[PDB]
DNA sequence: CAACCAC
DNA sequence: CAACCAC
DNA sequence: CAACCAC
DNA sequence: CAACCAC
DNA sequence: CAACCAC
DNA sequence: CAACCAC
DNA sequence: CAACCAC
DNA sequence: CAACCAC
DNA sequence: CAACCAC
């Protein structure tokens, strides 16, 4: 039961260790960016299956910001988009929402067929002068059998793939002040035998 | 399994993206206000079936209000009236309650046959000078097999209704200060074949 | 047996009566174009199923061209793109081939996933000073259950298409002279019930 | 068992409330006149099935006429005509009869294949100086599963349909003086899925 | 096995030996014409069943025409109209087509219900100065159980026809020159027992 | 059903888009040539299975050649040699034949064991001053499970081949003039698991 | 069978 | 269980 | 699962 | 489900 | 069906 | 399948 | 099979 | 039952 | 059903 259908070989990892600075406008990153090559943690051919994503790390408030009394959450929309073209679209223009508000957000009407939300998961942080909740921990494993397809070329970029691009979209709920998110996004995949 | 009884065609959506300023008196809006027309997100006949309501968004406090130390829950009441007539009745004259208190709110004895509460749900928010819970995220998917009927005229209003009509009543529990609720109310409906 | 799966209603028709002047470079047209409306020969919803395409007409030479001793054939590639964006792509840039020769034509290696060749069918014409053959008849019915989607907006254009979309690509085999093609491309479809 | 075969959707009504002034020569009206459009009580496509006709109202004598001692009946021939062309033919020239007499009337020999009588129903009124029967009531429901076909255009006119036109033919039995008939003819129909 | 349903008697024949000079505009003839009478090759009743049509003969060029380097084909559309009225309609006004091109010909959208194409069968001829092909043979048997009706009167004319009626429509593909067609159109029928 | 026995992975493609100028002597090319590498369209191991060959393109005359009254045909012998050594052998020395006539061609008696003719398929062209036929289309798909081996080294050459190896041999039937052949020879293979 | 229309 | 690693 | 959209 | 009311 | 790519 | 030779 | 006519 | 509306 | 005509 370990390896999925249409794909074979050892379960290959790929990590995206990064400190993401989050805003109200919303940040994006492509989680299914795999370079091609003979090396370990590379894809072999143009086709592979991402079995599971493991998001883990911490969301936290800056030292000058944490004094100010407020609350903010981040949403973590893991969305698959079929038909990925050019640059990855911004959070604001993919998601329909009232007054640029991430809590009210759903996929736009025109491109609802294109993009689908696989997971969303709120993580909340509260500021305070005398008593803050500076940080909150993220530990979300998620099994999502997602088959992707690349071009003839290889550079682990959003442009280079042409099917089921997996995108992580983040957005801070509070409008004024930002928050940081130190995250390891770890994607687990297998190389496809099909085609 | 997808389409309800006596219904046809694609699952049409209708959205009510809005910032509602809530009070102790209570605010109302009809969630079934949909126009008749050939286009998408329009009804075709006078009858149609609402399958599910997806309320999602945020409830939040203003900057001058959040300093003042208090708590308030917003009560969301989803009611169906079997009989609409004229404009929609205010929260005070539908629900009976001690001293206009929405936590004690149930339907009046006279019009208990008329109005029925399908779902109710709360959302707490706490203000504070040095440490606050400024906001709370409302997310609520509610499935209800509700058949609604309209007049011959087609303008998407509570006046044009007949038989059932889905009303959302929102009320702040605290007396003096108000709160905002930035909400997307999304109704999912199908066009009817019956009569 | 008549209507396909997930679609309903009367078999609606659409036609493209037009004289297409062909070159070696390659002409294109989108056969799945159909505007939205309450009237006949219009899609109701954004989704619809094309069940069958009926190409019929004539491919013919001009009076000054036919006198010259040569032969030319037209290929007629009916292709479906699962990802339409903006303007319909040119023949030369979709099909890779030696020296832009349409008889040596297959889909490019990059976008082999996007474009699929549903049908090809040649039609041949021979021009000579005395021993001539001015014209040739085309009569090709071809059945394909093909579910195309549109944007929210209503206009018969390849821009507005989404998910599946049909494209007829025509290209003359001989380099240094053209041929005309008077063709009724007819298309038979049904309105979708799904989503 | 409600909706007939080959047709679907809500049962749509169409009414013809009118005061028909009847003569010996005979009056006609097309009962299956349905305009096409998105609106309520419109047809959707060119094809629909009339399930049932409900004729109701009153036949009555004028104030100066009712003094004169006589009797007259009206026949109410509900006839389907296949092959409707141009204007609707007059009662006198469709029906063969002795000396322009409606009581002796049957369909003409040439166009017996074209026209068929679905219903006839006599309604009788008697005049008198000192004691009249001024009026008589009509209440005739009639179930007649009749599939009709329209042109590409739409205006709810006899010319605009090309199959199974339903015509009501009235004719006063007494030669000299006329009678009035205030009638609601109400036709019940469903939109066709076939073709 | 021989005689069709609802008809009886000896298989009566009828023939139309005639040189039909063809154009680009389109020539027509009614093959179901047969006068009423006690003699042979006459219908007895107003109804009769045409069981089969046997078209045979030659399609040929003139001596001055054949010298010119060109090609032309004739279409031979055998159609049944279920509603005959007056004179037989012209080819151009029944079949819609781009620039009156008979190879791009199908029945008009308005009267698609009235006219049905039972058979089409092309016949091709190539004219040249030396490398010529003056003529081409036509030999097409085609079986169709077809119940036609007449008026009360007795004359082999399309005027007098009613219910089904057969029409052969002929049209030359090339525009600027004619072709001759010496054709025996033969038709085999039986007298109806029904009605 | 898709992948052959003893081989695995995605169906890798290889192409040979080239204008082959043909003579009476006989041109050759090795269609099984494929270099070793981690990239796409490369064999991984020394062994691999060619499942199918798709020849498509055009065979055509030059402008000065076509005017002369003659005919020529090309044979297209697809042969497998089970013993490749060095450079690919010439057409004349493999096939024995009277006066180097390629239509009278079969494998020599000495090396009948080595070479086997898998497919032959003619393509004919006729040149004339006025009554010409400049070109002819080739479209030949042909499926053969064919396990080829290589040397230790990595280069797409017949030298490096071992065990089975494919060779396309082309030869013009007419002696005193050439013909061009613009051909995409495409080949579909899978990497071997055995040994 | 022809090409959404009919026996 | 934790997260391609192992009992 | 998240929310009429796809796998 | 929310609470004697309806679907 | 066309030609490793898809319903 | 091509044409006594092979998978 | 040819084309209402026959073995 | 009355007439596309509902028990 | 209304009356040789059609569904």
Residue numbers in the entry:
A (entry chain B), B (entry chain F), C (entry chain A), D (entry chain B), E (entry chain A), F (entry chain A): 63 to 257
Can I see the authors' text?
Structure refinement with D5 symmetry, yielded a density map at 3.3 Å resolution, and an atomic model for the CP layer was built and refined, starting from a homology model of the STNV CP. The capsid is composed of 110 copies of the CP, and we built and refined a complete D5 asymmetric unit of 11 unique chains (chains A-K). Each hemicapsid is formed from a T = 1 particle from which a penton of CP subunits is missing. The different conformations needed to build a geminivirus arise through differences in the N-terminal domain of the CP, rather than in its core fold. The biggest change is in subunit H, where an extra 23 residues are resolved as a helix-loop-helix motif (first ordered residue: 40). By contrast in chain I, an extra 8 residues (first ordered residue: 55) become ordered, but in an extended conformation that is different to that seen for the same residues in chain H. The helix-loop-helix motif from chain H is a major component of the equatorial interface, making a series of H-bonding interactions to a patch of predominantly polar residues in the body of the CP subunit across the interface (residues 214 & 215 in chain I), which is surrounded by van der Waals interactions. The ordered segment from chain I extends across to stabilize the base of the helix-loop-helix motif in an adjacent H subunit, presumably stabilizing the ring of equatorial subunits. The map was of sufficient quality to build 7 nucleotides into the density beneath each subunit, except for subunit H at the interface where there are 6. More significantly, a new interaction occurs between the backbone of nucleotide 5 and R41, at the extreme N-terminus of the helix-loop-helix motif in chain H. This motif forms the equatorial interface, and presumably the interaction with DNA stabilizes this structural element.
Whereas nanoviruses have T = 1 icosahedral capsids of ~18 nm in diameter (although no detailed structures are available), geminiviruses are formed from two such isometric particles, or ‘hemicapsids’, fused to form a geminate particle (18 × 30 nm) which gives the virus family its name. Here we present the cryo-EM structure of AYVV at 3.3 Å resolution. The structure shows that the capsid is built from three distinct conformations of a single CP, and that these conformational differences facilitate the formation of the interface between hemicapsids. The body of the CP is similar to that of STNV and many other viruses, consisting of a jelly-roll fold with two twisted, 4-stranded β-sheets.
